[PDB]
Design a protein around this ligand. Sequence first.
Ligand SMILES: *[C@@H]1O[C@H](CO)[C@@H](O[C@@H]2O[C@H](CO)[C@@H](O)[C@H](O)[C@H]2NC(C)=O)[C@H](O)[C@H]1NC(C)=O
Ligand SMILES: *[C@@H]1O[C@H](CO)[C@@H](O[C@@H]2O[C@H](CO)[C@@H](O)[C@H](O)[C@H]2NC(C)=O)[C@H](O)[C@H]1NC(C)=O
Ligand SMILES: *[C@@H]1O[C@H](CO)[C@@H](O[C@@H]2O[C@H](CO)[C@@H](O)[C@H](O)[C@H]2NC(C)=O)[C@H](O)[C@H]1NC(C)=O
Ligand SMILES: *[C@@H]1O[C@H](CO)[C@@H](O[C@@H]2O[C@H](CO)[C@@H](O)[C@H](O)[C@H]2NC(C)=O)[C@H](O)[C@H]1NC(C)=O
Ligand SMILES: *[C@@H]1O[C@H](CO)[C@@H](O)[C@H](O)[C@H]1NC(C)=O
Ligand SMILES: *[C@@H]1O[C@H](CO)[C@@H](O)[C@H](O)[C@H]1NC(C)=O
Ligand SMILES: *[C@@H]1O[C@H](CO)[C@@H](O)[C@H](O)[C@H]1NC(C)=O
Ligand SMILES: *[C@@H]1O[C@H](CO)[C@@H](O)[C@H](O)[C@H]1NC(C)=O
Ligand SMILES: *[C@@H]1O[C@H](CO)[C@@H](O)[C@H](O)[C@H]1NC(C)=O
Ligand SMILES: *[C@@H]1O[C@H](CO)[C@@H](O)[C@H](O)[C@H]1NC(C)=O
Ligand SMILES: *[C@@H]1O[C@H](CO)[C@@H](O)[C@H](O)[C@H]1NC(C)=O
Ligand SMILES: *[C@@H]1O[C@H](CO)[C@@H](O)[C@H](O)[C@H]1NC(C)=O
Ligand SMILES: *[C@@H]1O[C@H](CO)[C@@H](O)[C@H](O)[C@H]1NC(C)=O
Ligand SMILES: *[C@@H]1O[C@H](CO)[C@@H](O)[C@H](O)[C@H]1NC(C)=O
Ligand SMILES: *[C@@H]1O[C@H](CO)[C@@H](O)[C@H](O)[C@H]1NC(C)=O
Ligand SMILES: *[C@@H]1O[C@H](CO)[C@@H](O)[C@H](O)[C@H]1NC(C)=O
Ligand SMILES: *[C@@H]1O[C@H](CO)[C@@H](O)[C@H](O)[C@H]1NC(C)=O
Ligand SMILES: *[C@@H]1O[C@H](CO)[C@@H](O)[C@H](O)[C@H]1NC(C)=O
Lengths: 271, 271, 250, 252, 96, 96
Amino acid sequence: LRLLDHRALVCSQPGLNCTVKNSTCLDDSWIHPRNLTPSSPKDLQIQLHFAHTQQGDLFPVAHIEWTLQTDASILYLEGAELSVLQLNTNERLCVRFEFLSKLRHHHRRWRFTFSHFVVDPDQEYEVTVHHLPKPIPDGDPNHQSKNFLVPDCEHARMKVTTPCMSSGSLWDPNITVETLEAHQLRVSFTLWNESTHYQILLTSFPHMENHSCFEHMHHIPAPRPEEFHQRSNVTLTLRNLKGCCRHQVQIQPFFSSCLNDCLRHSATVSC
Amino acid sequence: LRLLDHRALVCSQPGLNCTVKNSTCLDDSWIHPRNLTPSSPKDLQIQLHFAHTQQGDLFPVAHIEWTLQTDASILYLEGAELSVLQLNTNERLCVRFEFLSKLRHHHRRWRFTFSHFVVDPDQEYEVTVHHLPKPIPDGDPNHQSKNFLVPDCEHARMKVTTPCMSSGSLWDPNITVETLEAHQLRVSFTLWNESTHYQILLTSFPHMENHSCFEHMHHIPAPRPEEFHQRSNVTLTLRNLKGCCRHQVQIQPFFSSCLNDCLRHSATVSC
Amino acid sequence: EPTVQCGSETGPSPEWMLQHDLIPGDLRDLRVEPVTTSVYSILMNVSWVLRADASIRLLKATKICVTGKSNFQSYSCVRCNYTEAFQTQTRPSGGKWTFSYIGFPVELNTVYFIGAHNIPNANMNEDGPSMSVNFTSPGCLDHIMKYKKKCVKAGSLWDPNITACKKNEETVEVNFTTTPLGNRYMALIQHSTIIGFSQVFEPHQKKQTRASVVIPVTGDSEGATVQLTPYFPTCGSDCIRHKGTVVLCP
Amino acid sequence: EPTVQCGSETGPSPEWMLQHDLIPGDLRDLRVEPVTTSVYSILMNVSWVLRADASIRLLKATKICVTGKSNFQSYSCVRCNYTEAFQTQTRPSGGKWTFSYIGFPVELNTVYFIGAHNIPNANMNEDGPSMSVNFTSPGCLDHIMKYKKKCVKAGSLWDPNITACKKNEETVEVNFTTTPLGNRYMALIQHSTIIGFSQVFEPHQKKQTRASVVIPVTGDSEGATVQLTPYFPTCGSDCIRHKGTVVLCPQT
Amino acid sequence: SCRASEDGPLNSRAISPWRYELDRDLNRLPQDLYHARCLCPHCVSLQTGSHMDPRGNSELLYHNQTVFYRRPGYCLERRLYRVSLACVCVRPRVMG
Amino acid sequence: SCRASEDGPLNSRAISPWRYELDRDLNRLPQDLYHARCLCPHCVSLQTGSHMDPRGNSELLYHNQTVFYRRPGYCLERRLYRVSLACVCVRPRVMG
Ligand SMILES: *[C@@H]1O[C@H](CO)[C@@H](O[C@@H]2O[C@H](CO)[C@@H](O)[C@H](O)[C@H]2NC(C)=O)[C@H](O)[C@H]1NC(C)=O
Ligand SMILES: *[C@@H]1O[C@H](CO)[C@@H](O[C@@H]2O[C@H](CO)[C@@H](O)[C@H](O)[C@H]2NC(C)=O)[C@H](O)[C@H]1NC(C)=O
Ligand SMILES: *[C@@H]1O[C@H](CO)[C@@H](O[C@@H]2O[C@H](CO)[C@@H](O)[C@H](O)[C@H]2NC(C)=O)[C@H](O)[C@H]1NC(C)=O
Ligand SMILES: *[C@@H]1O[C@H](CO)[C@@H](O[C@@H]2O[C@H](CO)[C@@H](O)[C@H](O)[C@H]2NC(C)=O)[C@H](O)[C@H]1NC(C)=O
Ligand SMILES: *[C@@H]1O[C@H](CO)[C@@H](O)[C@H](O)[C@H]1NC(C)=O
Ligand SMILES: *[C@@H]1O[C@H](CO)[C@@H](O)[C@H](O)[C@H]1NC(C)=O
Ligand SMILES: *[C@@H]1O[C@H](CO)[C@@H](O)[C@H](O)[C@H]1NC(C)=O
Ligand SMILES: *[C@@H]1O[C@H](CO)[C@@H](O)[C@H](O)[C@H]1NC(C)=O
Ligand SMILES: *[C@@H]1O[C@H](CO)[C@@H](O)[C@H](O)[C@H]1NC(C)=O
Ligand SMILES: *[C@@H]1O[C@H](CO)[C@@H](O)[C@H](O)[C@H]1NC(C)=O
Ligand SMILES: *[C@@H]1O[C@H](CO)[C@@H](O)[C@H](O)[C@H]1NC(C)=O
Ligand SMILES: *[C@@H]1O[C@H](CO)[C@@H](O)[C@H](O)[C@H]1NC(C)=O
Ligand SMILES: *[C@@H]1O[C@H](CO)[C@@H](O)[C@H](O)[C@H]1NC(C)=O
Ligand SMILES: *[C@@H]1O[C@H](CO)[C@@H](O)[C@H](O)[C@H]1NC(C)=O
Ligand SMILES: *[C@@H]1O[C@H](CO)[C@@H](O)[C@H](O)[C@H]1NC(C)=O
Ligand SMILES: *[C@@H]1O[C@H](CO)[C@@H](O)[C@H](O)[C@H]1NC(C)=O
Ligand SMILES: *[C@@H]1O[C@H](CO)[C@@H](O)[C@H](O)[C@H]1NC(C)=O
Ligand SMILES: *[C@@H]1O[C@H](CO)[C@@H](O)[C@H](O)[C@H]1NC(C)=O
C-alpha cells in the first residue's frame, strides 16, 4: 500500500520528459471537461514481482503495464492517472502522470509500466487507468480496470517474502504428540521469535463423530527473548472415557500482526 | 444419261482457267501413283434442276456441286474427274477436268458446280469425285460419292417433263363406267397421240373377296392419227351371276417407251 | 455540417496501396434492415453510427460491400464520401451521428453478408478494423411476396384445387383443375412409404376442368397425404408443391 | 527418322496471335493408356498417328492437354515438339507413324479428358479440327493397387477381423480386433432399416484384442448385415467400410 | 438412367449424379469446358442405388470462371463465363 | 444439430447442409471469404428432415478462385485460393 522508495522515480522512455507524482486522489470521479477527449488505452495488465529493500527485506510488488491504441487521438493526449482501490479496507491511493512533450506516432510501438507499489497478501486489488483531459459530459468512456488475486504466504514463492515472518508460515512448529501414559498426552513444539502468548486447544471427539467429550485450553505465557527458537513442552491429562480416542490439538499464536486472526496448526491423533 | 448438247462448256471461276472433256474412264488398271497426292474434297451435294429445250423438250437434270478443304494440299492439286454410274443397266459415263494454272489460297471459299447431264426418271444415280494424282498403293482415299433419288412421273414438277410426256402421265383418261343394262358395262375414255394399241382388262370379283368370277380382255387396234385425243367407246357384256357385283377394269398402253411396262389405270365399280 | 453523397465503385481503392501515418477509428455501430418501395422491388436500408470523442478529426469516406451466396456468387459494392469535414464529436443539435443509404437490390432466397470499414485503411501489422452483420431475405411462400412476376410464373398465384377420394381398395381417384400454364403433372402419395405413383399428360380444358385421374395404391390408402407437383417450364424441376387429402367416396 | 522431343508449357501459344496462311491437317488417330513403373507411380502412355498423304509438308509440333475433375479441378499440359522435317507420308521403312510420350501423373478416382491439336492452329471462322478421348483411373478396392502410402493410412491393408453373434432376442455382441491407428468406431446393422445402433471409444490394446461391444436390436436380428466404419483421421469421413455377418451363439 | 455405383469418383457415386457435356470453341482458354447435366429428375434411393426416390429435387450449382477470348492480329480480352459444377439434393417447397 | 428446413436458400434446405465461416485478412480481395463446413457427419433423412441417416457420407467440394495480394509503396500480385463451396451426399465404399 505505502510507497516504497522516495528516490526520484524513473519513467523515461525514448523521447519523453515524464514525471510521476502522488497528487490529490479525489477517488476516480472529477469534473474538468474540455473540447476534445482522447481515446482509451489498450491491453492493460498487472504482473507479480518480488524485490528486496536496502536492508534486504523482500516485499511483494505488482507489475502494472499497459499499451496504447493507434489513431490520431495520440496527437491530443495530455496526461494519465493511476489509481489503486481496496475492496476490504476501502482505502484508495492515486498516482499522477503527465507528458511534458507532445508525441507523434513515429515508431509503431509505445509501452508503459510501473512496479513501485507493495501489495498485501490475500487481498483483492483494483487498478484503473485514466487519460487526460477527462471526458466531456455525455461522452464515451476512456478508462479500463481489472482484478488481482494474491495467494497466501503458505505458497512457496509467497513464503520467502519478508513481511510474512511477522506472524508467518515459514515458522513450522515440529509437533510431537506422544501417547505417553493412559489418559495423559505430552505435546512438544518449537515457537518463534516473538514475545507474545500462545494457546493450546485440546479437544477429544468420539470415533466417527464430530461431537466433543472433553475440551481443554492451555495458556502459554509471553516468551522471553532467551527462550526464542526453543521447543516448549506441555503435558495434559485426558478424560478417562472409552470410545473418545480421537483427539484434536491446535496451536494459535497471538503475534503483533493478525492478532486473534492468525492461522492455527491442528494435529489429529486417532486410535 | 446423255450430255444435253455440244457447246463450249463454261466452268470458269475467278483466277482460274478450266477445260472440260469426255474421254476414256472406268479406272481399268488405274494404278498411277506419284509422290505427294493432295487431299480429298469436302461437302459434295447434288441438286435437281429442270432445263427447257429449243423445240420444247423440257428435261430434268441433276445439279452437282462440291467444295474444298483448306489444307496446304491445295498447292499440289492438278486435276479432277466426274463419274455417273447406273445400277440396273450398269451403263456408265465419265467427264474429265483440269486446272491449267496453280491455285494459291487467297480467300477461304471455293466451289465447283455442274448440271449439264440429264438423268432418267425414277432411277438411282451414283456420282463420284476424284482428285489427281491418284493415291499411292496403301494410301488414304481421296474420293467421295452419294446416292440420288429421282421421283416418278406423278410428281408435280416431274409431271410436265417431256421424257415423261413420252408415254405421258399427263395423258389422263376420263373414265366413264356406266352401269347401263344388266349384265352389260359400257366404258369410254380418251387416248393419247401415238398409234399404239390398248388392251382392256375387265375382271369381276365377288364383294368382300379377291377371287375372280369372270375375266375378259378386249383388244383396241392401232389408232389412226385422225383419231388422236378422241374418246374411244367399248361395251362389254358382264357375267350373269349374283353377288359378283364388284368389277375392276384397267387400261394399259403399249407405247414406244415403257412398252409392256407402262402404268395402268384401274377403275373399280361396286354395288 | 456534413452530409452523405453515395455513388458506386468495385475494385481497388487508390488509397490502399499508399501508406498513411495517421488513421481514423472504426465504425462504432452498424445496423441494416430491408425497406420496400412499391407503386416490384425491395431495397436495403443500412444505418451506421460514427466514431465518438476522437479519431474523427481526419476522415474521408466509408465503403460497404455485400456478398450473396445461394445457387450463385455475387459481389459488388458502393463507396460514398463525406462532403465536409467534422469539427465536433457529437451533433450540436443533439444525439449521435446517423447516416443511411438506399440501394443494393435483393433477389429471393439469398443470404447476404454486409461489411464495412473506414477510409483511409489500416497499414500492415495492425488490428482488424472491420465489423460485419448478416441478414436473410424472405422467400416466395410468404403472403406479401406472392405477386412478383417470377413466382406467379412459377405458380404462386395459381389455385390448383384438389379433391382426391379413395375410389376403391386398390385405386384412388384424384380431381384437380388444370391451367393453361402447364400440361403435365406428377403424383405422390405418402403415408409411411410410397403406396402409389403415376404420371399424367392432359391438355388445357376450356371444357369443364374436373379431373378423372385414377392411380393404383397398395394397401389401405385411408388417411394418407396427397402431394401434387407441376411441371411448369420456367421453374425447371424445382416448382412449388401443394397439399391434398384423402377423403372417402360412398 | 524423326523423333519427338517433349517439354512442359502451360498458357498462350505464340502462334495463336499471329496469322498463318497455310495450316496442316489434324491428328488422324489417338489412343491413351496407363503404364506402371517398377518400384511407385502411375503414368499415362499416349500415342498418336499423324495424317497421311498430305498436309504434313509444313508442320511444327503437337500440343496435348488434360483436364481431371473429382472433388477438385485440374488443368496442366505440355506442348511437345518434332525435330526433323517431314519429307514423305508414311515410313520409308514401312507402316504408319507411331509416337508416344510418358508423363502426366495420375491421381486416384479422377476422370481424365485428353485433347490435342496440330500446330499452327486454325484461324478464326474455320472448322473444329481437334479430336478427344476419355479415360478413367482405378480406385483403392483392386488387388493390384492396395499399397500406396496414401491409402494405407486409410486402412487399405488393414485386416479387421470381426465376429458378431446374437446374444439374445434384443442384444447382439460384436467381437473385433483393434488397431493402433484408430480409437473410435461406429456400428451399423441393416436388414430392412436400422434395427440397432451404437458408438464406442476404446484405445489400442497391447493385451489380447478380442472385443466386447453390446448393441441393442429391435425384433429378430437373425440374417442381418453388419457394417463397421472406422474414424481413421487421414480419410476423414470417407474411410473404407468392411462388411460382416451375424451368426448364432449357442448356449448349449 | 438413375443409378448409383459402388466405386469410382463422386459423379458415379453421388446421390444426385451428374455427367459431363462438351463445349467447343476456337478462341477460348481452355478450348474445352465440361459442364454438368445431372440425369435423374429426383434423387436416388440410398438402400439400393439403382432406383429413384421422388421425395427429393435436383438443382445445379454455378460458379464464375476466368476465360480469355480473341477479337480483332488479335486482342486480349478477359471476361468471365458461367459453368456448372455439381448438382445437389434439395428439399421441396410446399404451399398450403 | 442435423436439421432440414422448409424454406429459404439451399444451405438450410439441402440434405447435406453447410454453414459459412469467416476468413478475415487485411490484404486480400475480398477482405472476407466464406467457406463451407458440413454440420452433419452424415446425410439427413427425407421423411422428416430433423433426424440423421447413417447410410451416407458427407464430402466437400473445392474450386480455385482468383484473389489478389499485396507485398512490399506496395506491389500487387496474383495468386489463387482454395475455398470450399458445398457439401454433397456420397455413397459409402465397402470392402469384402
Ligand atoms: C374445388 O373444386 C370443387 C369442384 O369444382 C368445388 O366443389 C364445389 O362445391 C360447391 C359447394 O361450395 C358445389 O356447389 C359445387 O357443385 C362443387 N363443384 C362441383 C363440380 O360439383 C370446390 O368448392 C372447390 N374448392 C375450392 C377451394 O376451390
Ligand atoms: C371428379 O370428376 C369426375 C369426372 O371428371 C366426377 O365424376 C362424375 O360425377 C358426377 C356427379 O354426380 C356423375 O354424375 C358422373 O357420372 C361422374 N362421371 C363423369 C364421367 O362425369 C366426380 O364426381 C368428381 N369428383 C370426385 C370426388 O371424384
Ligand atoms: C478371426 O479371429 C478369430 C478369433 O480371434 C479366429 O478364430 C480362430 O480360429 C482358429 C481356427 O479357425 C482356432 O484354432 C482359434 O482358436 C480361433 N481363435 C479364437 C477362438 O480366439 C479366426 O481364425 C480369425 N480369422 C477369421 C478369418 O475369422
Ligand atoms: C468375444 O469377446 C468376449 C470377451 O471380450 C469373449 O468372452 C470370453 O469367453 C471366454 C470363453 O470363450 C471366457 O473364458 C472369457 O471369460 C470371456 N470374456 C469375459 C470378459 O468374460 C467371447 O468368447 C468372444 N467371442 C464371441 C462372443 O463370440
Ligand atoms: C470547442 O471550443 C470552442 C472554443 O473556440 C467552444 O466555443 C466550443 O463550445 C467547444 N466545443 C466543445 C464541444 O467543447
Ligand atoms: C526472528 O527474529 C528476527 C529478529 O526479530 C526476525 O527479524 C526474523 O524474521 C526471525 N529470524 C529468522 C532467522 O527468521
Ligand atoms: C522438551 O522435551 C525435550 C525432550 O524431552 C527436551 O529435549 C527439551 O529440552 C524440553 N524442553 C523444555 C523447555 O523443557
Ligand atoms: C519421290 O521423288 C524422289 C526424287 O528423287 C524419288 O527418289 C522417290 O522415289 C519419289 N517417291 C516415290 C516415287 O514414291
Ligand atoms: C401429242 O402430239 C404431239 C406429237 O406426238 C406431241 O409432241 C404433243 O406433246 C402431244 N400433244 C399435246 C397437246 O400434248
Ligand atoms: C362415244 O360416246 C360419246 C357419247 O355417247 C360420243 O360423244 C363419242 O363421239 C363416242 N365416241 C365415238 C368414237 O364414237
Ligand atoms: C468520392 O470522390 C472521388 C474523387 O472525385 C470520386 O471518384 C468518387 O466517385 C466519390 N464517391 C462518390 C461520388 O460516391
Ligand atoms: C458472376 O456471374 C453472374 C452471372 O449472372 C454475374 O451476374 C456476376 O456479375 C458475376 N460476377 C460476380 C462477382 O458475381
Ligand atoms: C432507414 O431506417 C431508419 C431507421 O430504421 C429510418 O429513420 C430511415 O427513414 C430509413 N430510410 C432512410 C432513407 O434512411
Ligand atoms: C450471423 O448472425 C447471427 C445472429 O445472431 C450471429 O450470431 C452470427 O454470429 C452471424 N454470423 C457471422 C458469421 O457473423
Ligand atoms: C518447342 O519449340 C519452341 C519454339 O522454339 C521452344 O521454345 C520450346 O522450348 C520447344 N519445346 C521443347 C524444347 O521441349
Ligand atoms: C488449383 O488449385 C490446386 C491446389 O491444390 C493446384 O494444385 C492447381 O494447380 C490449381 N489449378 C488447377 C487448374 O487445378
Ligand atoms: C506406349 O504404348 C505403345 C503401344 O503398345 C508401346 O509400343 C510403347 O512401347 C509404350 N511406351 C512408350 C514409351 O511408348
Ligand atoms: C467417353 O468415351 C466413350 C467411349 O465409348 C464415348 O462413347 C463418349 O462419347 C465419351 N464421352 C465424351 C464426353 O466424349
